[PDB]
Amino acid sequence: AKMRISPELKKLIEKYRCVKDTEGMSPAKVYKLVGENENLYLKMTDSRYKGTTYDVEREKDMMLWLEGKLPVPKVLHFERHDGWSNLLMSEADGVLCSEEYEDEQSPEKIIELYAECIRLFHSIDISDCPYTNSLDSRLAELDYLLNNDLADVDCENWEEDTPFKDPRELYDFLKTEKPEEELVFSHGDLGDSNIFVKDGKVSGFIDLGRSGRADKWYDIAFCVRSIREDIGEEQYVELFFDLLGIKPDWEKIKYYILLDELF
Numbered sequence: 001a002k003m004r005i006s007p008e009l010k011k012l013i014e015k016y017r018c019v020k021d022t023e024g025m026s027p028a029k030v031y032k033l034v035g036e037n038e039n040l041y042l043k044m045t046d047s048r049y050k051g052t053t054y055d056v057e058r059e060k061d062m063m064l065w066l067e068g069k070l071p072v073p074k075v076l077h078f079e080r081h082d083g084w085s086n087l088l089m090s091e092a093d094g095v096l097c098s099e100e101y102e103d104e105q106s107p108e109k110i111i112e113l114y115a116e117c118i119r120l121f122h123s124i125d126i127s128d129c130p131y132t133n134s135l136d137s138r139l140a141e142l143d144y145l146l147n148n149d150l151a152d153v154d155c156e157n158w159e160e161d162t163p164f165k166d167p168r169e170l171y172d173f174l175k176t177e178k179p180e181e182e183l184v185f186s187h188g189d190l191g192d193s194n195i196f197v198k199d200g201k202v203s204g205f206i207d208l209g210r211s212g213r214a215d216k217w218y219d220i221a222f223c224v225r226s227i228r229e230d231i232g233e234e235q236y237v238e239l240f241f242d243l244l245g246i247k248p249d250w251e252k253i254k255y256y257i258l259l260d261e262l263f
C-alpha cells in the first residue's frame with residue numbers, strides 16, 4: 001500500500017508539471033499534467049469505492065466504450081496499483097463549458113448546449129452498453145454507500161427544496177416512488193463542469209464513472225437543476241424543453257434531482 005501510483009505511471013508523467021485539480025468534488029483525485037506537446041490528465045480513486053460508480057476503473061470502461069460514439073478522452077494508461085484505480089487520459093478538446101460562459105449574457109447558448117447533449121445522448125446505441133444504471137442498481141449502491149459511511153450526509157450542498165430530515169427518509173422515498181424507467185444512454189452527472197464546448201458545439205465529455213443505461217429523465221433533470229440555479233428565470237427552462245421538443249414530467253424531474261442528493 002504505497003498510497004498512490006506505480007513506477008511506470010510515475011515515469012510517464014515525469015516530463016509534465018503536475019497540477020492538482022481543485023474543482024472536482026468527488027472522492028477522486030484529479031491532476032492536470034501540463035506538458036510541452038500537450039496536456040494529460042490523471043484521475044484516481046481508492047479501494048473504498050471499488051465497484052461503485054465512483055471507481056475510475058468503471059469510468060475507464062465507459063471511456064473506452066464511448067470512443068467513436070461521443071467526444072471523450074483517449075484512454076492513455078490504466079492500472080490498479082495499491083488498491084487504487086488510476087487513469088491516464090488525454091485532455092478533453094475544447095473549453096470547459098463552465099469556463100466558457102462563467103460570466104456572460106449567453107443563457108441561450110447554455111440551454112442549446114444542454115439540449116444538444118441530450119439529443120446526442122439519445123442517438124447512442126446502448127445495445128452493448130457495459131453498465132446499466134437503473135434505479136434498482138442505483139438505490140442498491142446508495143444503500144451500500146450509507147451503510148459503509150461512504151456518503152457525506154452532513155456537509156453536502158443540498159437543494160433548498162429537499163424535504164427529508166435525514167438520509168433514510170430520502171432513501172425510503174426514492175425506494176417508494178421509483179418512477180417508470182425508459183433506458184437511454186445516460187451520462188450520470190451532466191453539468192457544465194464535465195462538458196466541453198468549441199465554436200459553440202459540444203466537444204467533449206468527462207467524469208464517466210456513472211455513465212451507462214438509465215432513464216431519459218435523469219440527464220434531463222440534471223440540466224433543469226443547473227438551469228434553474230445558474231440563470232434564474234422560469235422562462236429559460238421552458239426554452240430548454242422547446243429545444244428538446246418535449247413536455248416536462250415534473251414528478252420525474254424532482255425524483256432524479258433528489259436521487260443525486262446523497263451522491
Ligand SMILES: NC[C@H]1O[C@H](O[C@H]2[C@H](O)[C@@H](O[C@H]3O[C@H](CO)[C@@H](O)[C@H](N)[C@H]3O)[C@H](N)C[C@@H]2N)[C@H](O)[C@@H](O)[C@@H]1O
Pocket residue numbers: 025026027156157158159160189191225226227229230260261262263
Ligand atoms: N458529492 C459529490 C458530488 O458533488 C456535486 O454533486 C452535488 C451537486 O453539486 C449539488 O447541486 C449543487 O450543484 C449544482 C450544479 O451541478 C447546482 O445546480 C445546484 N443548485 C446545487 O445545489 C446537489 N444538490 C448534490 C450533488 N451530490 C458534484 O456536482 C458532483 O460532481 C460530485 O460527484
Ligand SMILES: Nc1ncnc2c1ncn2[C@@H]1O[C@H](COP(=O)(O)OP(=O)(O)O)[C@@H](O)[C@H]1O
Pocket residue numbers: 021023024025026027028030041043073089090091092093096193194206207
Ligand atoms: N480530460 C480532461 N480534460 C480537461 N479537463 C479535465 C479532464 N479531466 C478532468 N478535468 C478537469 O478536472 C475537473 C474535475 O474532473 P472530474 O473528472 O469532473 O472529477 P470529479 O468526478 O471530481 O467531478 C473537471 O471539471 C475539469 O476541470
Ligand SMILES: [Mg+2]
Pocket residue numbers: 024193194206207
Ligand atoms: Mg466532474
Ligand SMILES: [Mg+2]
Pocket residue numbers: 026189207
Ligand atoms: Mg465525478
